Design a protein around this motif. Structure first.
Motif, PDB file in Angstrom:
ATOM      1  N   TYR J  30     -16.606  32.819 -10.580  1.00  0.00           N
ATOM      2  CA  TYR J  30     -15.702  31.714 -10.192  1.00  0.00           C
ATOM      3  C   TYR J  30     -14.246  31.975 -10.632  1.00  0.00           C
ATOM      4  N   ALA J  33     -12.430  34.130  -8.292  1.00  0.00           N
ATOM      5  CA  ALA J  33     -12.396  33.688  -6.905  1.00  0.00           C
ATOM      6  C   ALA J  33     -10.970  33.530  -6.355  1.00  0.00           C
ATOM      7  N   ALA J  34     -10.041  32.959  -7.125  1.00  0.00           N
ATOM      8  CA  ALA J  34      -8.632  32.795  -6.653  1.00  0.00           C
ATOM      9  C   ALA J  34      -8.058  34.108  -6.103  1.00  0.00           C
ATOM     10  N   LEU J  37     -10.071  35.418  -2.970  1.00  0.00           N
ATOM     11  CA  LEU J  37      -9.804  34.575  -1.799  1.00  0.00           C
ATOM     12  C   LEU J  37      -8.358  34.753  -1.284  1.00  0.00           C
ATOM     13  N   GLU J  38      -7.390  34.965  -2.181  1.00  0.00           N
ATOM     14  CA  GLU J  38      -6.014  35.328  -1.765  1.00  0.00           C
ATOM     15  C   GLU J  38      -6.091  36.602  -0.903  1.00  0.00           C
ATOM     16  N   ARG J  41      -8.111  35.982   2.563  1.00  0.00           N
ATOM     17  CA  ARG J  41      -7.240  35.216   3.494  1.00  0.00           C
ATOM     18  C   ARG J  41      -6.125  36.107   4.094  1.00  0.00           C
TER      19      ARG J  41
ATOM     20  N   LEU K  23     -13.192  29.712   4.766  1.00  0.00           N
ATOM     21  CA  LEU K  23     -12.702  30.148   3.436  1.00  0.00           C
ATOM     22  C   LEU K  23     -12.393  28.909   2.585  1.00  0.00           C
ATOM     23  N   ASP K  24     -11.915  27.834   3.233  1.00  0.00           N
ATOM     24  CA  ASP K  24     -11.654  26.591   2.515  1.00  0.00           C
ATOM     25  C   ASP K  24     -12.966  26.039   1.952  1.00  0.00           C
ATOM     26  N   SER K  27     -13.957  28.013  -0.993  1.00  0.00           N
ATOM     27  CA  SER K  27     -13.108  27.568  -2.105  1.00  0.00           C
ATOM     28  C   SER K  27     -13.681  26.314  -2.733  1.00  0.00           C
ATOM     29  N   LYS K  28     -14.079  25.375  -1.878  1.00  0.00           N
ATOM     30  CA  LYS K  28     -14.614  24.126  -2.381  1.00  0.00           C
ATOM     31  C   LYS K  28     -15.891  24.346  -3.226  1.00  0.00           C
ATOM     32  N   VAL K  30     -16.498  26.900  -5.089  1.00  0.00           N
ATOM     33  CA  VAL K  30     -15.952  27.355  -6.375  1.00  0.00           C
ATOM     34  C   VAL K  30     -15.441  26.171  -7.215  1.00  0.00           C
ATOM     35  N   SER K  31     -14.814  25.185  -6.576  1.00  0.00           N
ATOM     36  CA  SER K  31     -14.310  24.024  -7.343  1.00  0.00           C
ATOM     37  C   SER K  31     -15.462  23.207  -7.925  1.00  0.00           C
TER      38      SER K  31
END
Ligand SMILES: C=CC1=C(C)/C(=C/c2[nH]c(/C=C3N=C(/C=C4\NC(=O)C(C)=C4C=C)C(C)=C\3CCC(=O)O)c(CCC(=O)O)c2C)NC1=O
Lengths: 170, 159, 159, 170, 159, 170, 159, 170, 170, 159, 170, 159
Positions: J30, J33-34, J37-38, J41, K23-24, K27-28, K30-31
């Motif tokens: 986790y 992930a930032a 995912l950057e 995308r 991808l959103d 992301s969710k 992961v949150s």
């Protein structure tokens, strides 16, 4: 081998029938049979307490075995140690029913000194453990209570030899 | 294999102490000792007569073994001596079995590799079967001592 | 496991017929039947007294089992009924062992998985060890029938 | 299971101690023990001749089994066939010492009809083989010669049932 | 087993295509076909004489087989018919081997289980060894066709 | 390795093509091929009698091997002994078809002296057994009867070396 | 692997003596020796011309190998010497195969680990395939000697 | 079985020697031997290109096989697919040297339709792959160039049957 | 063990809790964590080129390794050799993420000198190979380009020790 | 393979529940992930440019791929379409890896059987290595998102 | 598969890059990660009591399971039964960390109904056991005490689905 | 077992280098270090109070342990010293786990063989469960440091 098979194996190597004197000696082993079964039954029926009380006495005498850094410290090592005491008593008990130490030599003791030397298991402390099981096992086997009275001295001497054989081997 | 080694083996194969299940087996071994020892003592005292008697019965059942040329036959002094030796081996193995309460001595010393030997040296199983039958017919034992002796003799015949 | 199934298993593991080695083992099983059956008959006639007696001895040796809160304890009517039930299971297994000449019934029905059960339900081995000791001390058997009963009781204690 | 273990297993499923009547019946099995051991000993001591003479009689009756193209033609097939006769007699003999057919059902007969159907082994001819071994085995077991005289009718009936069970199964 | 199936098996056991190593093996199989087929054709034409001749030689070498009581012997019309049948089986297997360039037919149809059969039915290997020796001594082949026939005959003798 | 593969393996270690002289020598091995196949065929076709007659002669010479207490006494030991003679002749026969002893060294002889020393098998008596098989095998291979006449002396010498190699190894 | 070692291996894997099945395989190996040796002798006499010729054909089919920067390429004197060395290794392995009647020498010395080497050093299989095709197109052999040489060349191409 | 062993196996089931007519037919198979070895050698020597060119043609014809979601999409699936083409050609080639389809039936095709149905491999597309290998294999085997001229029509028909047998089986 | 587990294992042998000073040292290992992961990531992401370029340099320096008769001559030997270089770098990389050499000692280096001595693999030439991978791995790990600038000297020294440990071991 | 499936697999291989040892591993997944995912995308938005750009760089590095005859080459419209398709597969696999925090998608869909495919279809690893290097040189990412993208790109290069 | 790998696997089958919307959604996930780890940690940290209390409640409700003759009567059967409850909770817990039921379907539930039907294990009583573990697991996971306050309703619904999936499967 | 050794083991079991999948797992181990180290430092500073406090809570929950005769009980000075020693072992193992980010230290030094020890020496799991609950109730930690400490404490309770 049991004691009968040993006599046979020695005779087969000479190509001979057993003499009447040897058949008499085998008869005598049969007459001692009920006593021998009592010995096996008594030791076996008390095996858990024999192992446990001997291990307890060992660790009491030699607290360094169980102190951090000691060979029997940690529950995995303590468990290995208890299992070794059980295994040795188990093979000694087989030798008693057999009237012969070959099963104990072949399947337990052969190579064990080496095994312990390689692992750093203190063979001498094992020997102490085995000798305390000897003392308890004989006191139990030879208890005059709850059995038909008679003389088991020859047998108790023979039991002694198996435990001593193990203690020497380790 | 004796009832005692089998009892141990059964316990050891499961990593456990002997239980009553095995002690009772050994009791049975002691209970049959009287009969087994009666047979062993008689067969042993009578060994010479039974061996030489059996050898002679085999030659009379199979006279060709006295005359056919070949090292596999009792058609020489060497051959006859081999034949009597062999029958003595069988009788001795029967006594050993009796003494230990089991087939172990015969199994280890005689039956393992038996088929290979007979085939290789061109020895006929039937010759030894007749020797064994002669022993059975001629030991003179009765009661459970005969049962015991015959059990092992028949064990060899089956082999 | 009984001396008979063990005899078969020993023969079958080697792909062979039963030999005298195994028949003598079964003879031993029959020879000890008198003692085993004396014990089984007595323990059975006395089952109610021995079970309820043992249960009461356990509570008196371990009074906390009558008072501590928790389903593992005999501090409720349910708990007491479980405890007496359990001790009855042990006594019944002893009789079954006697009847077959071996540990098989106890092994299969009780000992396999015993450690896992006691651990999971937080039952203390010591409670059952005391019940077993009460039975041994109170069956009133003598001679080889006591030897037989005590062999199996002690077998359970070791377990 | 042996016959004693069967009684126990039925009782354990009901949660019951054995009644005195059931202990009496078990006692009676013990009184029949020496006779049962004679039966096992006699059949076993004659096993080779029992198998061989039955197979010989079978092939004599059913020459098509051994003729070229027959299921027992070739030495590999004949050997398989002899081994099946031996195996069946072996498991029947275990059932006799046990006083219970579970070993014969569990380790021999269960799935055997299917096995033969898949291989094209004529199950019915096997059945004939098994029935001839039955007849020889009983005549041998029940021979009045060389044994203490008494009545083994119940046992010979019971032996019958195991052989018939096998013949039905194939 | 034929040189062709062996070549395939060698390739398949390694999960690979046939290489020249195996093609050359099959070439050898074709090169020896002339000799093998000379032998197969002669042995086949002469089958009746060789079979009945061998059977008679066996009885004369072992006259007891004509007289001893027992189903294993040629002392009955049934026995004699079995003996001639058997020898015919051996000769037929030799021809099959010749035809395929290998021991496969004898291996599968005759040698597998041979020891077990002879033992069970109390047939003496020596009787068939003499039949085989009669065939070898009497086929009348020469040159490499004799080599071929004798290789397989000797193969059976060794078995 | 066979003899051809050996020449190749030596050449590959030097990074060289085979010279015409070496190709000539390989050609010559091919010209000796039919003789070599006769040798293998003759020894193999007589393998049972070669083993059996040699063992018989050995036991005749050294009766202590078969007397009670002897290493070849008992049918299990005698069977092991016969199997060793067969195995050795089997590997020698592979060496003859290969024209190279590597298969015999690698799969049979390597470690065998040690094996016998550990078991107490009398290696020297084995050697005598192997030498008698040598003498019979050569007399059979080199029989002038029933074969096209020619000179096999080089081959019989080479066969000799394999048997001697085995006898030395044990 | 040669037809001889394969024959032995087939016998040894079954614990048995060599049978005719294997002797005939070895006969085939001798029968094809004339052709194999014709090819081996010719390829060997012509080795220098075939190796240097093949190397030049590869550079002309793939001119980038003469110019692209990198140690995997023949764009240096070192690279060219490696390339001619390699092609010489392939031709030498073909002769070894011919000499033993099998793929063994190529298998052991060249094909085992080939994929790993080409991948690691970034050598293109196509470069060696063209060298092999040049040898096939240019050895000048005919009849069964060409068949033999081409079988092994094609074996390498398949690898 | 090879074609010779098949004739033998049919004859053994009837208990018969082969007739001169059958020995003549076997002789004839030997006369066709060099041609058959050419066929095996030619197909085998071109196996990689046969597999690869057929697979390429298949994927060209049926682009959905290789498109995302297709059964041969991903390199693991494509690799499985190429290996299946190779395996089938490998077993077909064994059948050609044997002059009998039993090896191809027993070790390759038996159960393969089921295998593909369970995996969702499109058996029909496999069949197309096998038929293209058939066409290339025969054109290669039957190339009049670089071989002694003669008529291989019977053989090419027989080769056909093995490939068709495989295509039918999948 | 990793470096944290090592501290624990030493403390458990003394029966002690870790002191604040030891917890501080463990904290410090965590602060160096991102740098250590960069080191592992960089070496791993370049593993193929590290192995290949080092092997190439080795064979360039020591042409006798690859010449006919050389230990790395033949594609099977060359492949073994490349795999050894890869294996050693693989275990060194595990030691770097662990901050402890026990995995490299236990699973790779223990017994390797002996292994090579038995095979005739030139251990010293291996050592040269390992040292060239060391030099490339550090130059790559310690590349100031494409990373947040800071001082990795302690780590590069530690990486050094693992490669040197391997080179010494072979 | 993702850090989550690996955590499960590590627990399941030992028959145990997930411990903190595995939960902390998933925490790391986790935390990264930032960055992942950057990268995913950006690579995705720029997919068309990066794919067609990489394909053109490969042809310019290896111009022979535009001209050499053969289906393995981009010397036809079909070939060019295959090449751009392939490079698109690699870029898509990189994004999938980023999205799951692991090599699993590339491993399963692309790397397993890669060597076999390249060998069979005569595709040169170097062509894809250059495409991968073009992507690395041209994605335009910075910071830990570049680290992430480059880790997987380099993973493919190593493969 | 985990939930991320599932999205990828669906996209790979269509040959597509993930859209920004997908991808959103990832992301969710992961949150929601810390909440999901709490759920796994809480259920796992209480696994023994969850299994034991559910089994106790089951046997309390259905006393016939434990009565003589019952499927969970005898300590071997009771132990099997407890192990099944543990195994099911273990696989459910894997599904929760994965955000996907494939591990639970593939390695636990697939074929289990059949397994129980063959053994005579009452699948419906298992289902009751699983539903009580569900109720306890959620009450524990969703305990507002000792955690940062927030809304876990979506997760508790998702956890529900895995337990219900298991109960349905048995 | 630590997240680092597990990462290595996962790579090594597949014979491969560490991938991002494993590096991210180790990142998670570093990210949770702050909490784990807060807990380890606090539990350690407070060790004496927590150990002696837990021991006293156990005797008060199970007063019979202060009075029942037997070496398994804290009804002697020796017994009390053993009990406090044991609880100290558990607390020390919790700190070790915290320090390495995993259950490894507890697994190796304490949990392996635990069931066997408790059974053999007649120690009740419930006594240690109460000690563990006392530690949990009394460490005084909050936030993720409490989560960490409690995860390992609960791990031991489950054991
Ligand atoms: C094990 C290795 C091995 C191989 C490879 C082998 C091949 C082989 N094929 C041959 C002939 C032949 N090969 C062919 C085959 C064809 N002719 C054609 O025009 C077409 C299209 C075909 C397709 C198969 C023909 C017709 C002959 C001559 C007839 C014959 O020899 O049967 C010959 C005889 C010599 C010659 O004519 O060159 C040999 C030795 N022999 C071997 O031992």
């Amino acid at each position: 081998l049991d004691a009968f098979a040993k006599v046979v194996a020695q005779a087969d190597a000479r190509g001979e029938f057993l003499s009447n004197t040897q058949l008499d000696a085998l008869s005598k082993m049969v007459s001692e049979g009920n006593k021998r079964l009592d010995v096996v039954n008594r030791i076996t029926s008390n095996a858990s307490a024999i192992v446990t009380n001997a291990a307890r006495a060992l660790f009491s005498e030699q607290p360094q075995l169980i102190q951090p850094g000691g060979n029997a410290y940690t529950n995995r090592r303590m468990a290995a140690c208890l299992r070794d005491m059980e295994i040795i008593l188990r093979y000694v008990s087989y030798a008693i029913i057999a009237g012969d130490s070959s099963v104990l030599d072949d399947r337990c003791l052969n190579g064990l000194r080496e095994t312990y030397q390689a692992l750093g298991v203190p063979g001498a402390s094992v020997a102490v453990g085995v000798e305390k099981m000897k003392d308890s096992a004989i006191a139990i086997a030879n208890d005059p209570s709850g059995i038909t009275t008679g003389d088991c001295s020859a047998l108790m001497a023979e039991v002694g030899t198996y435990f001593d054989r193990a203690a020497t081997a380790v | 294999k004796t009832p005692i080694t089998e009892a141990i083996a059964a316990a050891d194969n499961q990593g456990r102490f002997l239980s009553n299940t095995e002690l009772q087996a050994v009791n049975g071994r002691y209970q049959r000792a009287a009969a087994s020892l009666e047979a062993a003592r008689s067969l042993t005292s009578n060994a010479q007569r039974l061996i030489n008697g059996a050898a002679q019965a085999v030659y009379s059942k199979f006279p060709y073994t006295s005359q056919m040329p070949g090292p596999q036959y009792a058609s020489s002094a060497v051959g006859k001596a081999k034949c009597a030796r062999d029958i003595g081996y069988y009788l001795r193995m029967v006594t050993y079995c009796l003494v230990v309460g089991g087939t172990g001595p015969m199994d280890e010393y005689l039956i393992a590799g038996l088929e290979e030997i007979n085939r290789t040296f061109d020895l006929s199983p039937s010759w030894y079967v007749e020797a064994l039958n002669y022993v059975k017919s001629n030991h003179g034992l009765s009661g459970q001592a005969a049962n015991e002796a015959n059990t092992y003799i028949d064990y060899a015949i089956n082999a």
